[PDB]
Amino acid sequence: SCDNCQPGTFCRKYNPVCKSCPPSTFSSIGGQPNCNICRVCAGYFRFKKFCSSTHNAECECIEGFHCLGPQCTRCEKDCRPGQELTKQGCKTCSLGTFNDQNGTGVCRPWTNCSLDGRSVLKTGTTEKDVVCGPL
Ligand SMILES: *[C@@H]1O[C@H](CO)[C@@H](O)[C@H](O)[C@H]1NC(C)=O
């Protein structure tokens, strides 16, 4: 009987009624005995999308932070030089690659100085490219 109810309602099998979900509460599937609690977005989080009767609120991260996980359940500090922002958060550049930008950019590979005739003056790290000699 309660299976005839649609999303944004709750319904108890002993007394079938498709009652609207109360405030700050939702249900994406209809006709369950209770509605789920709305997620509040505060502190490091802000609302991307407000809660409605049929779907949860979605959170976003404040300035200087980015979302971590599929439901943005954690914020992570924006990455430092020597790191790139992947879809799974900040990953340190692997051996042979670098990034010199703060809070942006991607891990590029080191300049091979011997593509020209040039020699290496300075070795490479995760934050600095190798420096080559004279052309
Ligand atoms: C640079 O290029 C040479 C010539 O193809 C290659 O053999 C070597 O592995 C490279 N070396 C570095 C340090 O990238």
UniProtKB/Swiss-Prot annotation:
Ranges of the TNFR-Cys repeats in the UniProt entry: 1-19, 20-59, 60-91, 92-133
Superkingdom as given in the UniProt entry: Eukaryota
Induction annotation: Up-regulated after cell treatment by PMA and ionomycin, suggesting that optimal expression requires both protein kinase C activation and increase in intracellular calcium.
Subcellular location(s) per record: Cell membrane
Ranges facing Extracellular side: 1-134
Residues bearing carbohydrate: 102, 112
Disulfide bridge positions per record: 2-11, 5-18, 21-35, 38-51, 41-59, 61-67, 72-79, 75-90, 93-107, 113-132
Gene Ontology CC annotations of this record: external side of plasma membrane
Tissue expression notes: Expressed in activated thymocytes, splenic T cells, CD4(+), and CD8(+) T-cells.
Protein name: Tumor necrosis factor receptor superfamily member 9
Gene: Tnfrsf9
Full protein segment contained here: 27 to 160 of 256
